[PDB]
Write a protein that binds this ligand. Sequence first.
Ligand SMILES: Nc1ncnc2c1ncn2[C@@H]1O[C@H](COP(=O)(O)OP(=O)(O)NP(=O)(O)O)[C@@H](O)[C@H]1O
Ligand SMILES: [Mg+2]
Length: 396
Amino acid sequence: EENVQEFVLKEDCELRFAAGDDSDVCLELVKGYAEIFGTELLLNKKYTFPAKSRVAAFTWKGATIELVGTTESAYVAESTPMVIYLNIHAAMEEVRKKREEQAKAKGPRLLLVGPTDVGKTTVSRILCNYSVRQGRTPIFVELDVGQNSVSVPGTVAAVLVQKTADVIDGFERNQPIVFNFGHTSPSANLSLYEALFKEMATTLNAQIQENDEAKIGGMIINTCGWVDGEGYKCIVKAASAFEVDVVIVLDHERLYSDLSKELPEFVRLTHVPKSGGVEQRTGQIRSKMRGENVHRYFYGTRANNLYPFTFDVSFDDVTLCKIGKLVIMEPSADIKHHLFAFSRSTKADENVLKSPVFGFCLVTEVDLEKRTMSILCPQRTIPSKVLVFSDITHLD
Ligand SMILES: Nc1ncnc2c1ncn2[C@@H]1O[C@H](COP(=O)(O)OP(=O)(O)NP(=O)(O)O)[C@@H](O)[C@H]1O
Ligand SMILES: [Mg+2]
C-alpha cells in the first residue's frame, strides 16, 4: 500500500525481501549502486515486484534502498557468496582473452549442477549478466524441463543473451532455439531427454560457426536438480555433449567428489555454497509456477503484454503426433488443455524427434462433431501443420 521501509546496505550486503502473498512491493534505490541478480539498478527508478516475488538487491560499495508496500520478509544479509560468483565470471573472461590471443576464438562453456533449490537459475542469471556487462554475448542454455526460464515447461531451450535481464521480467526471450521434450521431468523418458540435449549441442555448435560474438561469448548451462542415480550419468553426458570446460557444483560435496574422479582432467570443477537466501519450494508451488510460465508464454508480462489469438482449426488442416518413435494421434477429448508444439519439420517424420519447434499452442476446446479444435496461439495462423503433443496441461 503506502507504508515505507528504509534500508542502509554496507558494502557487500544484500537486501533480501519477499513480497506479500496478496500485494505488490515497489523498490527504489535512493543512494549509491546496487544490482539485482546481476542487473544494475537505476537510481531513483521505481521497480514494482508482484506478489510472492523473492528478490535480493546486492551492493558492491554501499547503497540505501526504499521499499514501499507490504513484505512477508525484508532484511539485510551481510554475508553472501557474491564474490565467488564474480570470480567465476572473471575466470571465464580470462579464458576468453587468452583464446583470443591464441588466434576464430571458442569461448568457455560452463555447466551448473546441484540439487534442487540451491540458487542455480539465479547463479546462471548473474553469470550471464556479468558477461553482457563485460561486452560479451553468451548463450544461455536451459536444460530444466520443469522450471524453464526461456520457454514453456517440457522444453529444452537456448537464447543468445545480448542485454542484461530485466529486473522484473528476466532475460528477453527473443528467437530462442526450442526443443519439445513434452514432460516435466527427464525421468519420464531419459533416453529421449539425452537425445534432445545432444541435438541441442550439435545445433548450437553449427550456429556459432556463423556468429563470432556468440562463439566467443560461450555458454552458461542450467540443469535440473536430478543429481542422484540416473540423473548423475545424465550430468556426465551433458558435460560431454556440450564440451564444457568448467563445471560448477552448488552445495553438493559428494557430487563434487564423484565428478572430480570421472570428468576429463582438462575440465575445471568448482564447488561453491548456496546462498542463505535461496528459498526451498514444495511441489505445489512448483506446479503453480509452471502454470504461470505457460500463461506468460501466451500473454506476456505486466511490462510487455502479449496478445494471443484464439481460433478454430480443422482436424483436416493439422496432423497431431506424440513421441514415445513417433505415433500419429486421432484428435480426441483427451488432447484438451494440452500444449502442442508447432514442429519445424515439414512432415510427421522421423525428423520430428530431431527438429526444434516454431512455438506452442494450447488446445482449449475440442469439437468432435464439427471436427474442429480451438487453440490459443501467439500468432494469427499456425506456423506449422505438424503439431506435437506435450503432456503439460493448462487451465486458463
Ligand atoms: N540471495 C538471494 N536472496 C533472496 N532470494 C533469492 C536469493 N537467491 C535466490 N533467491 C530466490 O530463491 C528462489 C529460488 O532460486 P533459484 O535460483 O530458482 O534456485 P534453483 O536451484 O534454480 N531452483 P530449482 O531449479 O527449482 O531446483 C527464487 O525466487 C530466487 O529469486
Ligand atoms: Mg532452477
